[PDB]
Symmetry: C4
Subunit: 344 residues, 4 copies
């Protein structure tokens, strides 16, 4: 009946969404071992609270890529949001701007960069999927710059491969591809370029001046390469545990990637973040911020824009209370010594 926390939206969404759709949303890869881990691993990290600290004034605002935001909790890119709620990306963009945070727009969105940008003022990032036809990629990137998007998140952990048993609602299209020259179900399928390599990151930088974030890094080895090749940030991710099963939980991999980057570029994380305590734990391990994926689609399905705003609020309030109880007045005061990781 009443939603006291983020995970509850999942039950409500499950009630109102067709089984096929809910299963598609919640699903991980294969055995779904990592899906569970992305969540479970946060509970193997304990707090080491500090006492006798004046926690009367808590400040959780931060600067991401130069942009000042209200909290280190942002929205990850989840494709075709209008399938969860007719408002779709419009609802999400408005909730994000209202909350004073960042929203990342998927390439497979049901609303174009300009439709989203029309909703109003707000900092947004554009998620890029590189197609074989570079011509289409260039068109998408310039279009994002024009629409006012602040950075490009290049997804590199794209899962491979229901579809034949489902029929999409009418008029739902991949709007970002409407206008640029290339059912819509297919075609876009074998369009993802699996030959993508670091040289392509170099090329991307020649067509745009926007910061390029590499989304899908879980090893210290690739983190170094990200820095060496000029990426502006790294997003420790395993695509919500939908790409390959038995890879570690992103929160387990975070520290090694943060270490490897050596403070050169900000490291972000997604995968399993549901509570304010999870946010604190990620920041204590070195992350500059976190992205949430699934909670966004579940709350959108549940209460639309109101649901998305509630998720962000609940997470903010929980994160604020966690800081007060741990003895932290600002993000700068959250230290690695404020938690005791499973390997500590």
């Amino acid at each position: 009946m009443e939603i006291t926390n983020v995970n509850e939206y999942e039950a409500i969404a499950k009630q109102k969404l067709p089984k096929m759709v809910y299963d598609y949303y919640a699903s991980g890869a294969e055995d779904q071992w990592t899906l569970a881990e992305n969540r479970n691993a946060f509970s193997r990290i304990l707090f080491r609270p500090r006492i006798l600290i004046d926690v009367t004034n808590i400040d959780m605002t931060t600067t991401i890529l130069g942009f000042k935001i209200s909290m280190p909790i942002m929205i990850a890119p989840t494709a075709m949001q209008k399938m969860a709620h007719p408002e779709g990306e419009y609802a999400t963009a408005r909730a994000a701007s209202a909350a004073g945070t960042i929203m990342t727009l998927s390439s497979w969105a049901t609303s174009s960069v300009e439709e989203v940008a029309s909703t109003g003022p707000g900092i947004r990032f554009f998620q890029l999927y590189v197609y074989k036809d570079r011509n289409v990629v260039a068109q998408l990137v310039r279009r994002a710059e024009r629409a006012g998007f602040k950075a490009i998140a290049l997804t590199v952990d794209t899962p491979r491969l229901i579809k034949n048993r489902f029929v999409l609602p009418p008029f739902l299209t991949l709007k970002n591809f409407e206008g640029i020259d290339l059912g819509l179900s297919s075609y876009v399928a074998g369009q993802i370029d699996r030959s993508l390599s670091w040289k392509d990151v170099a090329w991307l930088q020649t067509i745009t001046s926007l910061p390029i974030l590499v989304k899908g890094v879980i090893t210290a080895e690739d983190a170094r390469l990200a820095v060496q090749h000029g990426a502006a940030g790294i997003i420790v991710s395993n695509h919500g545990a939908r790409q390959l099963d038995y890879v570690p939980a992103t929160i387990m991999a975070l520290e090694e990637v943060v270490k490897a980057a050596q403070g050169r570029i900000p490291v972000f994380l997604d995968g399993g973040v549901r509570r304010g305590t999870d946010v604190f734990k990620a920041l204590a391990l070195g992350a500059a911020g976190v992205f949430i994926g699934r909670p966004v689609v579940f709350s959108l399905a549940a209460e639309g824009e109101a649901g998305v705003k509630k998720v962000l609020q609940m997470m903010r309030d929980e994160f604020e209370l966690t800081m007060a109880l741990s003895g932290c007045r600002s993000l700068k005061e959250i230290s690695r010594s404020h938690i005791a990781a499973d390997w500590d």
Copy 2:
């Protein structure tokens, strides 16, 4: 039917107390992970008994802050005991004096320092909650000194935030605040000063000469600060796992805090102590004594003063037998090598 051990009082109390009251007593924070840990962790520590030792005469008396007591098991402060049994703090004070041990009186007690002190001779400590109005704090402290209390336990792990669904029995008031100039349900709520810091420990020492114990320390870092700021003792505590979930069990945190204090001041522990074996394990890890919270309210609800005395006796007899079986004739002979901690 028959109570052979402390944990059984819980079942009996659960039978006779209103659900809301029992749940409030037994409850931990959030998932209650730490609530369980405070208990479970004691079972991950094994004994390493010594043989061929004359265990004919066992001595468990000790000196706490100069005061000689019969056993290293004392009573922690639990608010408004008259709600568990009409006798409340009177019963507790009398059982404690009879057992030759120490009782800590809560600030939120249903009996004033002088009501408790009227019960008779006995060593008692007063637990202080610092309100924003320092004037009230000073009044409470002087009043405790006058009533003969031997030390002040400053609680620093005070949980934040049923209340709207419960009605209190008639005449039950926070007696310690009756007379000093400041329903009673509210007001006292937003009175706790969350700006409390070490400078406030320094100030406390200017208004009283009584030993100040810092209650709510679980890190080596704050333990050092306790010593550096003149605290007379440290109580490793997590407020019965009611402040923040996912902090370690106090028995897991004990050794690091004992190490950090470097023998300068005595370190005590509360949270999950129910058996004589638990007491032994805490002492072997360096604690100078332990405090019990919940068992006190459960037995009080069950058999009143008789229940509280029985708890103390059962714990004493179990602790005595554990010493005899481990090869220890005095507390001084209980060594770190007498147990094998989970990390050993």
Copy 3:
């Protein structure tokens, strides 16, 4: 109904095979602790995928003992296959040749080396069980060379000791012993020579020029002896967990044996391999290839030659996808750093 993966053949085989036969096939030793481990241990090893790698062209062909094969997945020797399907070894030999891989022929086969060799062109290994009468051993070895077998796998982890309650189908005989001069149920029983030692490996090399692989090694100590005595390869095996219970899973023992061999001879593994991910993990740990036992008999019982070919295909496709997702284009690119073992 539909077989999407190898383990499913087991359910189908279980449905159509007599209980005694299925139980005999699936069974491990004693408590069957190792039987489970051979499988479970593969799940305690995580992947560490690399991104931005051109995985457009995957190559999994390899060279085993000089012979070029299509994939590092081969067939282990399982006795009397005609009991699982009338085609028996004929089906298996044909599926193996078709798949471009190697098949190892059991000494207790229901088809002779020449019957198997008659099926067509293909690389096959012959598994040798050393009988007390060396005369019979020599006869078997020369016969295998003549029939075109490429190497001898000397089994050394032969289990000791249903038989009295089962009756075999008519005409099923140990064909390899038909013709050479020595019911058939017995006799062959107490024929296995338990005095077999390294000196016997030296003797074997005097009667044949074929590579001798030592099958049944799980310690670094015996691996060294294998190399020192001239074995051409080692097969880390525990006889499908049927010899002795509580020995480690072969995947747990692999690395130590690979280390000990110091790259002198190839190390192979069998026991619990069912998925393409298992293959990858074994190769990352140093194995030059893997053998599958039980899946062969289960699929043979299920769909005969078609079942065996399907198993090999499913494993190939899963292995190929695992390489693409991990960032590996050839077997040479699969590194120890591509996984995170339970002890890492």
Copy 4:
């Protein structure tokens, strides 16, 4: 119906024995955590079998305190065996002599040293419980020497404290105390001397020349003291997990005690030994032999002398097979490297 292994006798004994008696036999202390551990810990130790070893001739005979016996498996002292079977100690003595092994006679036996010695030739040890009246102790020791007992096992882990609800069968008495000058239920109770110390071990050596084994050692510290005070052997024991709960499993404590003794005196073990694999594991860890307690009373209750002989045989055959499968032809060849302990 049929007993294939030792643990099965327990079910049969449970069927025919009164509940109170069976519960008394099987019971551990308190939570019975250690009772389970004594058994469970053996399963956390893996085998590391060696191959290509001539295991045609296995030899498990050994020399204990100069006496040559057929196997390293002996009988621990369990009080009043006639309560399990009318034959009691007579059955046990005869089965032990027949098996060519050693039997330890309890002080609380229902048959005297001379009754047991009358059964025939066999090596037996006498278990001593030291009473406060040294006069009685001296009488018992000389009587044991006279009866031909080869060593004294001084029990030091004697549990403290059903009795009031049970009535003993007629004529069952503590025969060893019949004749020496001191219902029989009581008296013997508060007769155990809890002031027993190492000086008492020194005194024991002045009244007898028989080897003194110290029974009840689980720490390296007391093992050293055993050696320093002239004990002839150590028995790593926790009294079948009946003295104090949460002490480690004897198999977990064995290695540290073996190390500490530095090969000066033989170390033996009891507690949880049920299988031939358990025996091997104990020997690999350094024990010179093992004692079995409970299996003796359970099989005695089940089939009397025939049951006891069967237990010893089953254990012998299992132990022999374990040696053959591990590559060991003599006890001298069983090495620490033949197993992989949980901490390895």
